[PDB]
């Protein structure tokens, strides 16, 4: 006795268990494998009525599930059900395929490529997923403007949506097509229209200096968010797309209110600040340029004052001006070091800006009397 009609009252309950997350046995697990194989093997419609059955075992199922999620009228008690929901069933879509294998290999056109598991995605599409997207999505971006605003909540909230777009995909071709124009597209225009609204407030209420400290301590909190929130998994540039929009946002849209401070924080050696301007600006393109500039500028200036001030007893005492110079030369090699870490580009600027000193002193002319 092993046709369908003997061991699908067997069977139906183990599939019960599995697609509710309940406990199983091991004894039940390879017992189910086994009665799939002796069925497809034994029972010429075999194959047919356990893809049926287990059909009608998914859609029952999946009907209950909508049941439950579709009861709530509220956006954020409908959220919180399809997370619970959600997070129970994707975890299941990798477990009830597998004593199924069997049944599989006997259908045409055969964890991806799982017939079993794609049926199992596309009913809950169907049904739950497809109707409330938008609420889900709408809802999700809200829990990140509150967080942003200081208030917590379960992160699985916004990762069981993140999820279901970038598995609930139809396309073939592009996995991540609904992600990228949907999920990821809502959550790059957030970020941008909050900080687009933070960002100029901040630094006209804070100034330069603190706006700095800011922008770095978004940058850092934005990107550990992305990390969480966003698709990492299918290797694709999501969160180097969130961190080019952030640093536009904080950084390139502020980026000559920033240079502009460059030049009096060379003057009085602020070291830790000039530090925190190269780490933001190297995050723009060409954004060390202006600094560079703005050093070997004061380089020169520092060693034309230095002439200016020596000329007068060059002839007499042209060991103290070497010295002076000397002296110049240590000052500013430790401030390349200390704010600049030794970085060849502002080394580069460095040794261009010893050279036009030594230069500009042979050919320096004194004032004749």
Known sequence: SLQFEDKWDFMHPIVLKLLRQESVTKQQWFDLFSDVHAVCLWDDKGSSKIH????????????????????????TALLKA????????????????????QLEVTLLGKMEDSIVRKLMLDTWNESIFSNIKNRLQDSAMKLVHAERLGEAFDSQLVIGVRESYVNLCSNPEDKLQIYRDNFEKAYLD?????????????????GVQNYMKYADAKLKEEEKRALRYLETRRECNSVEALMECCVNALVTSFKETILAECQGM?????????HLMFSLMDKVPNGIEPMLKDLEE?????????????????????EKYREQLDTLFNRFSKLVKEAFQDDPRFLTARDKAYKAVVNDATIFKAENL
């Not at 399809?82 to 294998?101: A, G, H, M, N, S």
């Not at 957030?190 to 006209?204: G, H, I, M, N, V």
């Open 52 to 75: 049926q059955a287990l059909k009608e075992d998914i859609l029952e199922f999946i009907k209950q599930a909508q049941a439950r999620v579709l009861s709530h009228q509220d956006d």
């Open 82 to 101: 399809y997370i619970v929901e959600w997070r129970k069933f994707f975890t299941q879509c990798d477990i009830l395929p597998k004593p199924f294998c």
């Open 190 to 206: 957030s970020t941008e229209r909050f900080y687009r609204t933070q960002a100029p407030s901040y630094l006209q209420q804070n």
């Open 266 to 274: 060379i003057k009085r050696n602020e070291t830790e600040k000039l």
């Open 298 to 318: 004061h380089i020169i200036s520092a060693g034309l004052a230095d002439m200016v001030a020596a000329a007068e007893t060059i002839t007499t005492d042209s």
